[PDB]
Design an enzyme around this catalytic site. Structure first.
Site, PDB file in Angstrom:
ATOM      1  N   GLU A 105      -1.645  -2.742  25.379  1.00 44.06           N
ATOM      2  CA  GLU A 105      -1.121  -2.889  24.035  1.00 44.06           C
ATOM      3  C   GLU A 105      -1.478  -4.275  23.540  1.00 44.06           C
ATOM      4  O   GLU A 105      -1.537  -5.235  24.346  1.00 44.06           O
ATOM      5  CB  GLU A 105       0.383  -2.764  24.214  1.00 44.06           C
ATOM      6  N   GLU A 109       3.839  -9.499  16.245  1.00 46.27           N
ATOM      7  CA  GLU A 109       5.237  -9.283  15.992  1.00 46.27           C
ATOM      8  C   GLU A 109       5.832 -10.405  15.172  1.00 46.27           C
ATOM      9  O   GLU A 109       5.620 -11.579  15.482  1.00 46.27           O
ATOM     10  CB  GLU A 109       5.985  -9.203  17.323  1.00 46.27           C
TER      11      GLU A 109
END
Ligand SMILES: [Ca+2]
Length: 214
Positions: A105, A109
């Site tokens: 991944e 964020e």
């Protein structure tokens, strides 16, 4: 050679591109249940994810993800995260055991406790610990900016408004994954996200997403 290059302006919905998470919770640190009704399409062409509350201390959050998977190339997103302690707004690629693969991944964020910074990270075969927090020089919650990562076999390069801001050089993920965007409140991670105070509704918006393959 998985998904092809595409440009998604969020102007209309067609089958075979995206899917909403609905009705279950990720559990763990995610303290909310995904609801399809929390992923909305605006008439001016934006994807709007909301974090709302149904009842006292019960939170509903939102996640939108691609149906196909995509590999190396440049991932760009124009977005505006939510600002509030205790939450996260994100743009990331993801594959894992649910998809029958190792956990790889790459993330962007925005910790709502401080939207003048962004957090970059990645997981390779389930190994994380690469968090890098960068100061943006502006409050990302105030308007749309372009965030991107170039994912190649030997490096990940992240950019903010076209300027290179971080480069990762080791143990780069190799498994094609889905493009995902989500907005959620956590529990159990106050040190990282701050404590969530229950404020709602909160929204993160996405104007467009673009993927350019090699
Ligand atoms: Ca748009």
């Amino acid at each position: 050679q998985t998904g092809g290059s595409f440009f998604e302006p969020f102007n209309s919905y067609n089958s075979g591109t995206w899917e909403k998470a609905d009705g279950y919770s990720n559990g763990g640190v995610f303290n909310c249940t995904w609801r399809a009704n929390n992923v909305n399409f605006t008439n001016d062409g934006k994807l709007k994810l909301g974090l709302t509350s149904s009842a006292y201390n019960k939170f509903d959050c939102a996640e939108y993800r691609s149906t196909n998977i995509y590999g190396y190339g440049l991932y760009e997103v124009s977005m505006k995260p939510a600002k509030n302690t205790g939450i996260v707004s994100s743009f990331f690629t993801y594959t894992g055991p649910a998809h029958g693969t190792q956990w790889d991944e790459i993330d962007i964020e925005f910790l709502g406790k401080d939207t003048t910074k962004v957090q970059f990270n990645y997981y390779t075969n389930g190994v994380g610990g690469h968090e890098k927090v960068i100061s943006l020089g502006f409050d990302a919650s105030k308007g749309f900016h372009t965030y991107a990562f170039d994912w190649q076999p030997g490096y990940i390069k992240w950019y903010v408004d076209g300027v290179l801001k971080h480069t990762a050089t080791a143990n780069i993920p190799s498994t094609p994954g889905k493009i995902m965007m989500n907005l959620w409140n956590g529990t159990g991670v106050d040190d990282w996200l701050g404590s969530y105070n229950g404020a709602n509704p909160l929204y993160a918006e996405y104007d467009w997403v673009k993927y350019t393959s090699n």
